[PDB]
Amino acid sequence: YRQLRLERVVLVGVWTEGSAADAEASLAELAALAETAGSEVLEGLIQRRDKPDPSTYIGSGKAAELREVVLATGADTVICDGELSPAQLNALEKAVKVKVIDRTALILDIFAQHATSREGKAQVSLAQMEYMLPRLRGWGESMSRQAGGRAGGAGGGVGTRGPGETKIETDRRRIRERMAKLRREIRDMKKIRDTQRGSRRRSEIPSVAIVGYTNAGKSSLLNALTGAGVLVENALFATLEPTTRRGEFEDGRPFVLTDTVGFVRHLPTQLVEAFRSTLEEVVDADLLIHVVDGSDVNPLAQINAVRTVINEVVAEYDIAPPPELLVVNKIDAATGVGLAQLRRALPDAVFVSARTGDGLDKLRSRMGELVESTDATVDVTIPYDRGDLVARVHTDGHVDATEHTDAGTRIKARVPAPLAATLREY
Amino acid sequence: SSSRNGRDSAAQRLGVKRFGGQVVKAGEILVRQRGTHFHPGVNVGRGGDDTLFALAPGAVEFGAKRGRKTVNIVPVARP
RNA sequence: UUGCCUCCUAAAAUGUAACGGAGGCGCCCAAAGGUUCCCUCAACCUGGACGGCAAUCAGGUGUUGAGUGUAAGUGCACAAGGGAGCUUGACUGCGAGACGGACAUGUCGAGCAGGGACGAAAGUCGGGACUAGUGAUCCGGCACCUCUGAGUGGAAGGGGUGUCGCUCAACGGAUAAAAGGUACCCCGGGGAUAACAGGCUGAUCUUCCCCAAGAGUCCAUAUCGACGGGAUGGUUUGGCACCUCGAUGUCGGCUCGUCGCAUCCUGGGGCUGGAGCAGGUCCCAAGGGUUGGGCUGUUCGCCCAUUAAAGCGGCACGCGAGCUGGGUUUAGAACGUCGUGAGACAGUUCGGUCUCUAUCCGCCGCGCGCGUCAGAAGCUUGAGGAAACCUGUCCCUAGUACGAGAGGACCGGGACGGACGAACCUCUGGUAUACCAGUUGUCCCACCAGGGGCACGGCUGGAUAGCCACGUUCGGACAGGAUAACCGCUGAAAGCAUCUAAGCGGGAAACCUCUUCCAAGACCAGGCUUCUCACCCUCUAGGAGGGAUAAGGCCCCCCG
RNA sequence: AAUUCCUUGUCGGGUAAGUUCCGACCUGCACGAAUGGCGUAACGACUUCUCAACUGUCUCAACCAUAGACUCGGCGAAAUUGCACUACGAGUAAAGAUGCUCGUUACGCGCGGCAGGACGAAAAGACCCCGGGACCUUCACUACAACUUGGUAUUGGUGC
RNA sequence: AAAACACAGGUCCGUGCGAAGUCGCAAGACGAUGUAUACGGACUGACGCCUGCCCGGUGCUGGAAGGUUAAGAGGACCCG
RNA sequence: GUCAGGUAGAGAAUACUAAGGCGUACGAGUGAACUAUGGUUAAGGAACUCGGCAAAAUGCCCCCGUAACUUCGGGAGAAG
RNA sequence: GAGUGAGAAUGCAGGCAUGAGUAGCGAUUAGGCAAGUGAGAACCUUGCCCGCCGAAAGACCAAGGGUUCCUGGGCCAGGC
RNA sequence: AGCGAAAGCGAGUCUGAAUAGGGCGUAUCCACACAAGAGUGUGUGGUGUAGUGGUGUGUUCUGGACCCGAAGCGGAGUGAUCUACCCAUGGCCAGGGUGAAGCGCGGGUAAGACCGCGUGGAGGCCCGAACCCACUUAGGUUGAAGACUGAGGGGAUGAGCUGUGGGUAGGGGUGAAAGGCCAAUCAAACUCCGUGAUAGCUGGUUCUCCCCGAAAUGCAUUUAGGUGCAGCGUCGCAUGUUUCUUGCCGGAGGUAGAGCUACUGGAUGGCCGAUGGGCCCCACAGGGUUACUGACGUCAGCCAAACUCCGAAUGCCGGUAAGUCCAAGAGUGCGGCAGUGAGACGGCGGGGGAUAAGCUCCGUGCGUCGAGAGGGAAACAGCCCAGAUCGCCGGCUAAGGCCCCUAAGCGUGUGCUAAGUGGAAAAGGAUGUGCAGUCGCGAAGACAACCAGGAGGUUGGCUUAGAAGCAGCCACCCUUGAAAGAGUGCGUAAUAGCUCACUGGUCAAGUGAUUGUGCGCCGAUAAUGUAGCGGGGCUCAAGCACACCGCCGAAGCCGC
């Protein structure tokens, strides 16, 4: 990918759904995304439009005022709060004579610049190749000044000229072959991703997947609960790959905490099909931890966006994760006084600051009931000579305290079914 | 989409023309320069274009006054 | 972009290109010129009413960092830098010498006279500190002339001196006066110059590798390997234009293949987060195979079924003197867009002649002559090649090992199969142009009956042979040896250890045999046997030239 | 959409599969009402698809008769030709070698066939470019035709 | 060989009669031995529902009160 | 341009034939490959293919019956 | 004093080579036999069979060609 | 007899106020003098002035202008027998189907409308011959045919086809319009004529010998493949070392290099560090802690084509001395005559590029080819040696070679090589050897090995499911100093085992790490067939490094 000069940006949108408050929230979200990507928001405006214009996405008068304001502000970058077409952007650029992009372009740029591993780097690269695929003919610069780019001649018999297919068709063929190879690669690495956790889910153990829109967890909850410090940030879309740890109850059974990358509303429908890591992880997860901010202007918007994405993937993959418990964190920030408004209709709203915080005792005590569904529930009496009667009765996972007796000891705890099925004797 | 440069000026033939220990006639253009990079010594005058030209026959020599390099024309002293 | 000026590029004289790097000019000054004289800034401290830190004035500290009308460079503090008085040399006639120089241009000039200016009185001034601020020639304007005046006198007109008229800016300025289309195209040229391919480089691309931050429920290396770095191949996009424009026919498809392994399966190994089954990686391994269709010309790709697979690539993006022409890529036509329009689309849609008797090599067979040391024949070895090499399902082993269980083996055998190839016609089936039969029309055999010629053998139902596949039989091996990956034994160098340095070994569809075929033109021209093995004339005996000859072969003849 | 580059727009039909096709939604790059807009019965050697039968188009090809081809006899050309008792691999070369270097292979001469090459034959490349043309277009220049206005001779006379 | 052309049906423009248009330097001719229900030119192309707005620019038609404008009447001044 | 027979045929098409005219001008063999023309083909019937290109199939006369649509004519020889 | 020197201009005219004794010998009718002329016969003649056309490959005209029509002689040229 | 434009003058004249500067002639020279020597002038007396007409040669002017070659322009005419349309007059369209108006009957409705009933045989009607076209397909595609045939195909009573005879004729015709056709050609026909059109373009240009011998550069160009001039070549005329090389001497440079406290810029870390913010008392009085920021300074260390306090080597200009001096066949000036004005590669400094390209543009008294043979390079223009007058059956040599091809050595000695490296190659790793130094131990037998050594409170640590030497943890001042540590790593979840920082008796030299000295390994890896020494072969060197001996080696030198 290619990164150019930033920090001089304008924002254009059309408010065709929701209310003025929602349009403003979308504008603010775009502003925050641009800020994180490394831009300085100068002016962002929304037009009350039923549907975007098929020429400039804004309209003639809107484009005029945008030209005026951008010329006065000395910026050269425009950002549309949506998914514009090559036709839209061609006019939107011819009207201003400065670079133009949209929110999906911004998100692909930030993903590309935040990518950590070759895996995600290739995923994001494929996303941007497939977004730029339509602009072969749509690339007016590629298909302009091209008089005589090929052999515009014919004849009966010997021609000797070998553009047997239109130059544009050859370009389409080559880019299609490149994209096919990349798709084959991203499908191939499915097996690599699988074998990486192959050991996991073989020895069945509860898996709690931490889900949340972007800027919700940013691995902060992971670092706070498990105790393992990983890349945690207040910026957006910082955790680019998942990570599991050992955190659990006092019980020896591990509760593998599955990290999840953020999910921004209104995805560009290019990563939801490429970045399969988190999707597969939530598919195979046993419990779900839904992260929410208690000081946001509309937490319910993100809540339902996440719920919708989850339901879509669930119906797509033929699964059903019943356990779905939410948690309204970011209350220690004290930046939201709608705490009563949230609590009057949303239980399990424990409080943790944006980056730090505590008070997850109630969280854990309420979450355990949904994962501590073991079937052991077997007691036994070990005889005088314990000897080797310590292997899986004490040196195991979910092992509990018990009483003591002269004839060895009455172990009133629970022994795992697969580990110790019948080895014990009452 | 081009280059903004590509043109210069015909290089005027600057540079000292007659060197030390060289017989010179009266009026010969000793040195052509732009700044007074060679102040006019004795029997040598500075023209309009800051150039050095002899005034009397003889041979050219290069000398230095206080913080300046100049040219002089020593006579011939014919036998 | 086209002229001119400045620096670098530019390689310490000059000069020096690039569609190389940064900029300026097509001026402004009647004072910003000439001369006489005077003075020295930029910055800093001590004081403020502003006056900011900083507007003015003093003391200084301060030696060129300010400023030089205009870009930059060269110079200027001795001043070209700042201030002031007078003045107009911002002259006339010239001007030895010159620099630069294709030519035309351009630039400097001591010094003489006239009449000046400034200075005390020598002295300086023929514009601007220099380098750009401009345009030749022709043809005409304007003023002066002590030039000429088509017989004379004049006058007109001509001549000269001074000077004016061009973004002639494509700026050495072909006209005083000039824009486009050609896919209707034509002609002379070019591989000096493109599209296709070939060639060079490998930016781009493909396959990796190099230390490893982190991921991988702990753990960097079981598996990924970020940031960065080093390469291989030249199959993509590419860059150069080196052969080809007195033609190298261009994509896909079809036929045919040959080759590399960077291996899709099949075959051998190590690690695995390999309990078993399942699998995942990396090493060796190119012998064989690697499906059939819908879509679109499509290569690709998606989808439906399978199987082990439906591998990637080169060979002019293999193959058009082998084929089709789907669209590419002519002439027709229309839609949307651009052009006022001819026309264009680097958009879409319909339709649009695909030539050639194989000379040489090349390849598949076929022969004739000669050779393999008397002339022949029979049977063969085999130097060397060629052909082929695929594999699935199920039963037992064994519900056995393993695994609490779910599930479920390895190695072994046994049967049946998919594709491919060879052979054959006994079976099935196809074909059958003199077979048999039924039959339509017509004409003929005098005529009825019975027959024949023609009509695709007239048509129709059969049809032996031959040929053939849809049919039948068979092959893919078992076995030996040396190895690749890998696995071990004795063992010092290095009293130990070590798969290695000397050795011994196991080790795969790879390799050589084993299978089939060709094969002594295998010039090392082969081996074992059998057949007549004998004779005459000429040059003048030295080897030859003829003669009929032996076995045998051939010719012709009946033939397959 | 003969109009849509994105684009195989999205949904529903057709097949097991539909970048072609039909019905819809419409975000019409770049529909549009006499350069006519939307339908339209019949018609079309126009284009696109779908269905029944049909069949060697195909799985997958086989056999048979003719003109051929081939043998024989007769008559008897041509396009092409610098040459010749014209091999292959690796190369090197004007970068693709029968003709050059190293090696491998090959008895002399033909017959029938296959078409990889001899950058094979034919057409001094229609393509691209340079120069010359040609034809056509126009708010390129300069002219003319044609049309158009006035003066002027034909053309003269009485009044205000 | 077609979707292109033509086509019957439409609309507009011009033509008042040796009409316009066309051939022709001209004569003359076709137009037409016709006469606006005709002829010529332009576009569209049976038939049904219809052709929405705009005369800004260029064309076409027609104009009065004005401005520019060649040829000729003109005969001041100057000069030879 | 004029004659236009006989049979079946609706027919000047088609098949064979009347009179008439020709075997027309390189031939003889030969089951090579392969090409043109035909012919035939098991089982499936377009799976080849760009595309049913070609090839194949119905085809004639008489009876019934004949759709949406339609300008009321047609579609239509529908189809069966 | 020269029309003064060829090896080339895809040069020009004449004669010749290889390709080569190869292709080809001009359709969807087809010939055969006996005899004869002849020295020489597949193609000539006669006889006898078979086949082809028979809204013609028959018959008669126009234009077109112009002596080809027939009799008698010839086979150097032409009939592939 | 020349000067100016001219009048006009005259060896002077023009410019000119100028008897003063210049331009032009007084052919040219000799001697004399006078000022000067600023480049010499002025004069005086003598020599005195060479052009023109034929003629050849070489060029150039106008004519065709060395020859061939277009497309096309214009004048005059020929074409409508093909084809387009039209006009006059004839002809043709087999056969089978459909039923419109029209006409009379009835039901019908006051009456109409309509419904049928029979005749009717039209319609740019239907099927389909002749006929006219050419939609598909196969053939043909040096054909039978310069446009056809076999099969199918459309119309086939009309806008029909066709005969006969006429008209429309080239900037014109005609055109159901396709840039169609107009006699096999039509984006402007055909034949003659201008005409031998023109070509900045292609091709060709014929006998010999001798001498000399280029450039592909600069400038300008409606110019970039052309052309003028310049340079370079050649012949003549004159100068005759003035050329060139070397030495010495006098010179300016600002490049390479180098520096930044010497200017301008970028920037590596420290020192005091105000200047501002925090909090500061929230008073703006008022005191500074200050991870903040701390200028300018300062310590050290850098970098730059458009920075230079400095600054070379070459190069260059000049003076001088020699050298070559039977010749470099030098330089300079003037003519006769061109080509040249597409360069390429190699070394060097560069630009563009990715500091890639056999890439492109540059400078290089640098080279070669170009224009150049010979030997080495495998063949190979740009590489190395070397510039071919000819012959020789002579020799010595350069580069390169010396096992066979292939001429010369399987040379002599000292070492390395294990990889066939040699006889491709990177980042990286690495107990190979060749060889330098160096470490505490240390010929006490060092060290290894055999060795008695198996929980010290040793189940502590954080803790109690045990923390069971021992999951792991932050410490080992721990010894009759024996060779063991709250025992760490091999293992035990728990014991249990034994190594590890470590050992007495056996008593027999190594033990780590550098230079890695040069050589080695891999890394290493495309497709027709060894294919990365020419091959065979080579380590019993025929490989590598160093010494010495020789020999072959060309068209070079020498000998005749």
Side-chain angles (χ1 to χ4, degrees), chain A residues 1-64 66-426, chain B:
Chain A
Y1 64 97
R2 173 225 43 67
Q3 312 195 135
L4 265 170
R5 291 210 98 194
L6 277 296
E7 314 286 331
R8 276 292 181 174
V9 286
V10 292
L11 322 170
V12 290
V14 305
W15 162 37
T16 180
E17 72 291 22
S19 300
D22 173 33
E24 291 168 349
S26 172
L27 198 77
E29 213 168 54
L30 179 60
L33 202 74
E35 293 264 355
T36 310
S39 313
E40 294 292 328
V41 170
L42 311 161
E43 284 96 342
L45 55 86
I46 45 170
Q47 185 209 35
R48 170 71 176 290
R49 198 182 261 279
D50 51 357
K51 34 188 161 196
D53 193 86
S55 69
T56 57
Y57 183 78
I58 42 169
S60 83
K62 299 302 304 198
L66 274 298
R67 179 84 195 87
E68 294 293 328
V69 300
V70 72
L71 196 55
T73 48
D76 56 338
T77 53
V78 189
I79 299 95
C80 320
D81 73 350
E83 181 161 346
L84 272 68
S85 71
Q88 298 266 12
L89 63 93
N90 271 292
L92 190 52
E93 185 281 323
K94 287 289 291 305
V96 291
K97 314 314 302 181
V98 286
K99 277 293 295 196
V100 299
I101 56 169
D102 57 359
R103 65 177 283 163
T104 187
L106 181 56
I107 200 76
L108 66 86
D109 188 358
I110 187 168
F111 264 70
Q113 88 193 357
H114 280 192
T116 74
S117 68
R118 205 268 296 166
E119 301 89 41
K121 288 173 72 71
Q123 276 170 10
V124 175
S125 81
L126 183 63
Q128 64 83 28
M129 274 81 80
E130 64 192 4
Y131 184 108
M132 61 79 71
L133 175 67
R135 280 162 215 87
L136 314 187
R137 309 155 200 188
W139 205 318
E141 275 198 350
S142 169
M143 331 315 298
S144 173
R145 302 145 296 177
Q146 208 177 7
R150 55 169 177 78
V158 179
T160 307
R161 70 200 65 84
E165 271 78 13
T166 314
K167 289 284 306 152
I168 192 75
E169 180 64 340
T170 73
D171 303 351
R172 195 149 89 166
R173 290 172 168 190
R174 293 299 87 69
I175 192 162
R176 280 190 77 159
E177 285 179 10
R178 266 88 172 272
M179 301 155 28
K181 290 164 73 173
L182 296 162
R183 277 205 165 72
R184 191 177 65 255
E185 284 186 348
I186 63 151
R187 292 277 71 204
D188 279 33
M189 61 195 278
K190 165 54 167 286
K191 83 189 77 172
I192 306 306
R193 277 208 323 291
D194 302 315
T195 187
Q196 267 184 20
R197 75 192 70 77
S199 162
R200 306 208 309 99
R201 317 317 312 164
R202 194 181 291 170
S203 65
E204 195 58 29
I205 46 169
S207 171
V208 307
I210 187 164
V211 70
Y213 62 105
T214 186
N215 206 8
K218 310 312 306 311
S219 299
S220 175
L221 267 291
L222 174 140
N223 290 353
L225 192 68
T226 53
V230 307
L231 192 147
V232 62
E233 304 184 1
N234 62 358
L236 278 79
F237 283 106
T239 313
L240 268 284
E241 274 169 352
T243 176
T244 49
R245 304 292 172 194
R246 204 70 53 73
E248 83 293 6
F249 267 100
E250 57 84 11
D251 301 311
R253 60 186 309 178
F255 286 10
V256 295
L257 173 51
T258 309
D259 191 331
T260 63
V261 183
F263 275 121
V264 71
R265 199 212 316 291
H266 187 273
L267 299 152
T269 184
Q270 285 204 0
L271 76 164
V272 67
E273 302 94 338
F275 169 66
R276 296 174 195 74
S277 313
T278 300
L279 279 81
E280 276 173 35
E281 287 295 354
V282 61
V283 162
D284 59 50
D286 307 316
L287 184 136
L288 273 69
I289 294 284
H290 194 272
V291 184
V292 185
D293 184 359
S295 297
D296 197 281
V297 301
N298 195 350
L300 270 291
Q302 303 286 37
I303 282 158
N304 78 283
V306 171
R307 181 176 288 170
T308 45
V309 172
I310 288 280
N311 295 336
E312 163 165 19
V313 296
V314 176
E316 188 154 45
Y317 305 135
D318 204 306
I319 60 170
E324 173 170 323
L325 178 54
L326 73 165
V327 165
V328 194
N329 67 7
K330 295 163 180 290
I331 287 162
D332 271 323
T335 45
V337 291
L339 183 60
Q341 162 267 326
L342 288 147
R343 287 182 187 285
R344 83 189 216 275
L346 304 164
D348 192 42
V350 288
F351 54 111
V352 174
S353 179
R355 304 290 86 68
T356 174
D358 211 324
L360 304 181
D361 312 333
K362 194 254 188 182
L363 160 57
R364 196 188 279 277
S365 78
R366 209 159 178 287
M367 173 216 77
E369 288 84 6
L370 285 88
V371 294
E372 188 163 359
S373 298
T374 191
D375 63 358
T377 63
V378 173
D379 300 338
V380 68
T381 310
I382 306 305
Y384 293 81
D385 56 355
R386 185 170 210 77
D388 297 304
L389 274 291
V390 176
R392 277 84 74 187
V393 71
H394 279 310
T395 56
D396 209 325
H398 55 84
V399 298
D400 198 356
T402 181
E403 68 192 66
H404 204 295
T405 69
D406 60 353
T409 185
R410 275 168 74 196
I411 308 298
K412 289 188 164 288
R414 62 184 70 75
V415 303
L419 277 296
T422 308
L423 281 85
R424 80 297 189 274
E425 286 84 5
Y426 195 81
Chain B
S1 184
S2 72
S3 57
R4 59 203 164 276
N5 296 295
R7 74 281 191 191
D8 76 339
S9 195
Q12 288 77 350
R13 280 68 165 162
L14 296 179
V16 65
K17 309 302 197 190
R18 298 290 189 288
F19 304 161
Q22 194 159 16
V23 72
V24 63
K25 286 207 195 180
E28 294 300 338
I29 288 300
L30 275 295
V31 179
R32 289 185 79 79
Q33 66 185 2
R34 300 291 150 215
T36 62
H37 184 54
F38 298 125
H39 290 176
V42 58
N43 290 304
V44 63
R46 171 182 166 188
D49 55 2
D50 206 306
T51 58
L52 280 292
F53 54 110
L55 267 67
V60 59
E61 213 69 3
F62 288 75
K65 314 322 271 173
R66 180 272 171 273
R68 48 179 51 167
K69 164 42 81 173
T70 187
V71 300
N72 161 26
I73 297 169
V74 305
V76 304
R78 66 198 267 274

